[PDB]
A paper describes a structure:
We used full length and truncated versions of purified MinElp3 in crystallization trials and obtained well-diffracting crystals for monomeric MinElp3Δ1–19, MinElp3Δ1–46, and MinElp3Δ1–54. We solved their structures using a poly-alanine model of DmcElp3 via molecular replacement at 1.9 Å, 1.9 Å, and 2.1 Å resolution, respectively. Although all three versions contained various lengths of the N-terminus and also showed no signs of degradation, we could observe interpretable electron density only starting from residue V72 in all collected and refined datasets. The overall structure and domain arrangement and interface between the rSAM and KAT domains of MinElp3 are almost identical to DmcElp3. The main difference relates to the Fe–S cluster loop region (aa 87–123) and the Fe–S cluster itself, which were both completely unstructured in all monomeric MinElp3s. We previously identified a Zn-binding motif in the central linker region between the two domains that is coordinated by three cysteine residues, which are strictly conserved in bacterial and archaeal but missing in eukaryotic Elp3s. In our MinElp3 structures, we could not locate any bound Zn-ions and instead observed the formation of a disulfide bond between C384 and C389. Nevertheless, the equivalent sequence still obtains an almost identical conformation, indicating that zinc might simply contribute structural integrity in anaerobic bacteria. In addition, we observed that the acetyl-CoA blocking loop (aa 466–486) is positioned outside of the acetyl-CoA binding pocket, interacting with the last visible residues of the N-terminus and also contacting a neighboring symmetry mate. Using our DmcElp3-DCA structure as a reference model, we are able to show that acetyl-CoA would also fit seamlessly into the active site of MinElp3, indicating an almost identical ligand coordination and active site organization.
The two domains form a cleft that contains several highly conserved basic residues, which bind and accommodate the tRNA anticodon stem loop (ASL).
Residue numbers in the entry: 72 to 87, 123 to 534
The structure:
């Protein structure tokens, strides 16, 4: 069987899910209830806004949609978005993360301002491909230049950046896809924090369906998808987090393409056969290593580790606590020296804490030591202390701004941070 995490994922659908006529409150509440039915904790919630067009909707609609999702978490009505957010800072169901999915050409400064106002902590760009040939071929409404610019504006606003990517699009190839993944992790224009990967599928009613019928598009089968994703994972940097390889599309709607439901497991077994190692965040995090391999961090070998890389014109500092003998990731912090910020509260003497993650409670149903956690052991506070030290003593910055989930602001207050516009900030 699978694993129970301490963070509840609540994914909701915006208007043009079907059962609740896209009501934000009913979707959020129904998902929480459903999770409580099966004994999954719901005190910490990652809210995911699905649709990819949300940032293009009227602001009135966005504010209301997020307000009502928070109302369902707060279990009470609110007069406005801002009040629902204030209430949620101390509610029983805290919004610790808010991910908004969007097309890369709907990611202007104005839209980023609005997303920060909503409390967003992560933005998933519908990149699909980094090659303009492929994008025009499939009549996508964005360029690779859109993706690059959006990525930079997001990073320099302190937000986590996720790329949705599709191997096997029309016009592509196995080698071309492999090159795309190498470029995404070694070209500073890209360097995303997360990637969501799934091979391109043929679903009736899409342009891809039209191309497929014309004989223009033969989608990847399992073998091809496995080869590309296995390569991608073998080269993923330690600072990249991947999504569980899966899809919420039932096999009876897939005209052509990968139908089987265990693509992630197939990739894993292929990587074993070929001796391909995976060092990315999902592969090494405590809960996954315990579920997969039955072992726990060896405290004699837990160290603070640091890895730097150039991204979108600036410097990313990836700090982690890690069992370096067994290569197990316990916690990490993303610190950025920004490049060309535009937000009012970001100086040229400002460092950005874009993310702090301590892997916490986790009920591994398939192991005999069931519950395991690593919060309240000091790793988060030690990562923050190191981040402040690096910011002040190495980069000569004078203030540090934290991108904080609504429901996480209380944590940063305990560490001396105060609200600074959309962020939690501290003078160094």
């Amino acid at each position: 069987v699978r694993t129970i995490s301490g963070v509840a994922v609540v994914a909701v659908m915006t208007s043009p899910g079907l059962m609740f006529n896209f009501d934000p409150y009913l979707q959020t509440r129904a998902r929480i209830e459903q999770l409580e039915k099966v004994g999954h904790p719901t005190d910490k919630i990652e809210l995911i806004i699905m649709g990819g067009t949300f940032p293009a909707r009227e602001i009135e609609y966005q504010d209301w949609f997020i307000k009502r999702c928070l109302d369902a978490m707060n279990e009470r009505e609110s007069k406005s978005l801002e009040e629902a957010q204030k209430i949620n800072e101390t509610a029983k169901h805290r919004c610790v993360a808010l991910c908004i999915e969007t097309r890369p050409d709907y990611c202007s400064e104005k839209e980023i301002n609005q997303m920060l106002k909503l409390g967003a902590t992560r933005v998933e760009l519908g990149v699909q491909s980094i090659y303009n040939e492929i994008l025009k071929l499939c009549k996508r409404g964005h360029s690779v230049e859109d993706t690059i610019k959006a990525t930079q504006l997001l990073k320099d606003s302190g937000l986590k950046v996720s790329y949705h990517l599709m191997p096997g699009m029309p016009g592509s190839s196995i080698e071309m896809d492999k090159k795309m993944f190498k470029e995404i992790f070694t070209n500073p224009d890209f360097m995303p924090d997360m990637v969501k990967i799934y091979p391109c599928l043929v679903i009736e009613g899409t342009e891809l369906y039209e191309m497929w019928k014309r004989g223009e598009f033969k989608p990847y089968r399992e073998e091809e998808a496995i080869e590309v994703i296995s390569y991608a994972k073998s080269i993923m940097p330690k600072w990249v987090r991947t999504s569980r390889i899966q899809r919420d599309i039932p096999a009876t709607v897939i005209v052509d393409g990968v139908k089987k439901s265990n693509l992630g497991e197939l990739v894993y077994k292929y990587m074993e056969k070929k001796g391909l190692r995976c060092r990315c965040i999902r592969c090494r995090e405590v809960g996954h290593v315990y579920y997969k391999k039955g072992i726990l961090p060896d405290p004699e070998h837990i160290k603070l580790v640091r890895e730097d890389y150039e991204a979108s014109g600036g410097t990313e500092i990836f700090l982690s606590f890690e069992d370096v003998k067994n290569d197990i990731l316990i916690a990490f912090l993303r610190l950025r020296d920004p490049y060309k910020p535009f937000r009012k509260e970001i100086d040229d003497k400002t460092m950005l804490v874009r993310q702090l993650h301590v892997f916490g409670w986790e009920k591994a149903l398939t192991r005999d030591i069931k519950e395991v956690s690593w919060q309240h052991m000091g790793y988060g506070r030690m990562l923050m202390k190191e981040a402040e030290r690096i910011a002040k003593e190495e980069f000569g910055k004078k203030k540090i701004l934290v991108t904080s989930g609504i429901g996480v602001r209380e944590y940063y207050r305990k560490l001396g941070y105060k609200r600074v516009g959309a962020y939690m900030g501290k003078e160094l």
